[PDB]
């Protein structure tokens with residue numbers, strides 16, 4: 001039967017799409033297998049590629065800070081991953097065939113963890129999860145900051161889209177919006 005360990009093993013030696021040729025390390029994701037909160041980003045950047053870990057760059061450090069200061073959590077209490085797990089060449093967006101190739105890893109991760117809340121960071125991860133939900137996706141600007149109920153298997157999963165933290169690095173107002181979004185996420189997390 002499946003496990004997060006198996007997914008990690010498959011991912012780190014995975015050659016199922018053309019992104020494999022460009023990487024130093026695949027990025028399978030990390031954190032608590034019974035996390036109530038699961039963060040899903042787009043694809044790895046250059047620091048993530050170098051470390052084999054998600055959200056470790058400047059954007060990741062901001063994420064970490066918000067998780068600590070606003071949610072009140074350490075990273076090892078949540079689960080963090082990406083819809084695509086290898087860094088696209090020249091940091092382009094992933095292509096449909098790449099999202100198609102890689103996303104079953106994410107489906108499998110969701111299947112195992114069954115989080116209370118999935119926080120989708122940015123337009124790509126949000127659009128992917130919306131497609132699995134069967135929810136119409138317009139733009140990240142239009143859907144961010146709202147909770148969506150995803151009936152999945154026996155559970156309701158709350159999906160909460162927001163901006164990617166990299167977008168908040170040099171934009172004070174957008175960072176204030178992300179912070180407010182994380183406040184709503186904490187409220188969702190602590191409410192029965």
Ligand code: SF4
Pocket residue numbers: 011014015016017018019020026084085086098101102
């Ligand atoms: S991006 Fe995903 S499917 Fe493509 S090689 Fe990396 S782990 Fe495999």
